[PDB]
């Protein structure tokens with residue numbers, strides 16, 4: 001699609017068999033989702049944002065669909081205020097910013 | 100332009116007579132710039148995200164030139180680690196996400 005920005009760029013994602021809403025976020029290096037169960041081992045990661053840093057769980061090679069596009073990559077799980085699809089997965093679905 | 104997302108979408112902006120680097124951020128509702136002087140009255144605001152909230156000053160009807168494209172709107176000023184161009188100005192320069 002071509003997604004304009006008058007509204008939040010919220011799309012449906014599918015992860016773990018579950019549909020969720022997430023923000024397509026070009027300001028995010030990484031993809032961060034609210035607490036949920038994911039398979040396998042995780043590794044620690046610290047991410048920084050507007051209010052400081054937080055610890056998240058990093059899961060690699062997670063199958064996730066983003067607005068109907070399949071991706072397989074790293075998903076961080078933690079106390080994010082909103083599910084965020086970052087550039088690691090935006091690149092996998094071929095997204096660009098255009099003006 | 101068409102901006103791929105392999106790297107952070109950082110661009111040069113001009114605001115308040117000053118050149119700065121800022122992140123084109125589709126996930127941001129608002130535009131937030133590091134501490135600087137701007138004209139007019141302001142009001143305080145708390146903005147949230149990863150790591151919690153920071154207090155900022157809200158200035159209205161500010162012009163920012165974003166990679167050569169002028170936009171006017173509300174600009175927040177405060178202790179952001181990264182200058183952020185949010186949707187309120189991305190819309191004005193006709194930015195879209197495409198995939």
Ligand SMILES: CC(=O)N[C@@H](Cc1c[nH]c2ccccc12)C(=O)N[C@H](C(=O)N[C@@H](Cc1ccccc1)[C@H](O)[C@@H](O)[C@@H]1CCCN1C(=O)[C@@H](NC(=O)[C@H](Cc1c[nH]c2ccccc12)NC(C)=O)C(C)C)C(C)C
Nearest residue numbers: 027028029047048049050081126127128146147148149181
């Ligand atoms: C690996 C890593 O940590 N990378 C960082 C980037 C980075 C590199 N060096 C650093 C050094 C220090 C700090 C950060 C970095 C990274 O990618 N961070 C991401 C991140 O937080 N990105 C921000 C942009 C940003 C980048 C860098 C510094 C600060 C901020 C997101 O792109 C950005 O889109 C996030 C997610 C959604 C909204 N939002 C924000 O931070 C914005 N908040 C908003 O737009 C909120 C949204 C909202 C509505 N209702 C709410 C209720 C609760 C909480 C939030 C909300 N609105 C308002 C009005 O507050 C503010 C910029 C205004 C996370 C998600 C991985």
Ligand SMILES: [Cl-]
Nearest residue numbers: 004005190193
């Ligand atoms: Cl439009």
Ligand code: NA
Nearest residue numbers: 014065068069
């Ligand atoms: Na599906």
